[PDB]
Amino acid sequence: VPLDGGRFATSDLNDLYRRVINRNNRLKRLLDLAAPDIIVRNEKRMLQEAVDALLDNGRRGRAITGSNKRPLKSLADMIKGKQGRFRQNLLGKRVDYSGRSVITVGPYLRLHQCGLPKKMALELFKPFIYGKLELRGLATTIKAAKKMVEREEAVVWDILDEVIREHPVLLNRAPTLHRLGIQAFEPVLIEGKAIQLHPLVCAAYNADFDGDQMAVHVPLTLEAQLEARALMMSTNNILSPANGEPIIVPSQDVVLGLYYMTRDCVNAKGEGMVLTGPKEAERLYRSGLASLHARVKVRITEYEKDANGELVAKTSLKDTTVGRAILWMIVPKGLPYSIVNQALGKKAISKMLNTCYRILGLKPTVIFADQIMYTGFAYAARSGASVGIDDMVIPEKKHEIISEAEAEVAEIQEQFQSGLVTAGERYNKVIDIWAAANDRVSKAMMDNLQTETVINRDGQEEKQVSFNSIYMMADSGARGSAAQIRQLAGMRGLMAKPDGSIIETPITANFREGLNVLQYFISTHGARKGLADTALKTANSGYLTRRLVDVAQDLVVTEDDCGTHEGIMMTPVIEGGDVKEPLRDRVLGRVTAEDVLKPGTAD
């Protein structure tokens, strides 16, 4: 095929094929001329070479293309393709009806939907729109339909809302790892060029909002609609396939909200009063009378279905706070008030969802989950958590710890100066005290930071766990960890020189203070190795999953019960101490090999 400017472009096989013919033909001539043997032989060798280069080039000499250095590609190279082993099914294939762009938040969404730009949706469904437009007769014929939407006549937008309604779209993010990398959503038309994505799902995709882009795919055939709805829909996969724990667990803002919701200070507006039920608890709160967190008795009605498919009801006076009371409005049915009466960290807040699922079933867990998010963001929004520079509190004793540990190193140095201890023994020695010092500062600043809110109810003093912002973040499970906090307030670490030794003069400053020239420079090596290390551990993981799906792949659940009594004995891992992992988790959801006994038997 021709190109612009009249240039031509062609496959390399022609250059190859052409040669086999020429050489071949010359040989036919050379027979009728009865040329000497030395020649027809040479021609014969040349003919062999040409065919070799045509078939699979590179097993002898690698013939090069004409006027172009690069070796011409043979049929064997056509089959191989490249990027390792990829035959064009394996590397990928471009696909119609698809698109992609940057994704953003959309907290309003229900978990089953996602924000899709109007224009993307116009161009994506173009054929569907054409069909509905002339089904109702709003367009005389298919051509005119094109002209209408190309014109963007006001009527089509309403039509698009029809064809969109029940019609899922697939959303996908870049490194698809587990099956949750593709999930189906119901489209909601959105002005703007960005895709809006339900927050609860952001965990499964490993999608941050830093500009990650997602691609969209329209399932066309009906079976794809029904496959999408019953398989790839968001709500139908709420649990990680890796382990049964819910993967929809609220992430960070929401968990800061609920933690800030259910938490209690020692003395707060409305402390001690009593209320009939949660309705009037919110009524107290919204009005400014009662604090979100104050110890209060309120009447609640919980339910237990422990009858046969049947819910028991019980009402009692629970000793709780205002927040837990308010939140109780959401917990559906079955569940006990016991589940919300705690501080509601990220871990408990997940098992909240888990029990909700394993008890009430699916639908309630979804709708519960939606509610949890909406309420989480909201109250977190009310809370006004923030972070200032004075929210990171350094221990008053830091300089003193450092100084003592600084005497120790100078003591051991004197012991090395006097030869009382060997050089190697010394290195370990100094590092031991410094390692120990850091732990000390860490568990110093941790004590001060955690509880030092010291407050008074009607009396002199009392002290509870801090309401300091940054602690709330780490305690809740929202973000941050004692490790990262330790670098903010307490000293940060002992870095390591490139060869792997670890420097015996740790970084005594932290981020709240400044790091000086030297200290930063030393931090660089660790930093740079991390990025390098992670990017490689990234590649290894990918490589491993590859081998893994290759060895399995075609394995599928086929029969129902093979009916073998055979099986393995499951015990908790019990490593050296008590229970590094229980039995209850190991056996859950598996099937018993044989009836199991009580301590007495025929039971």
Binding site: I38, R41, N42, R45, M46, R60, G61
Partner: peptide, 29 residues
Amino acid sequence: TDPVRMYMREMGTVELLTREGEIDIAKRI
């Protein structure tokens, strides 16, 4: 392999003709 080599060596066996030898063969022709 690379037939330039197996050629170069296959013809390299043949000895150049003497000025007399050319005529001999030509006469033979």
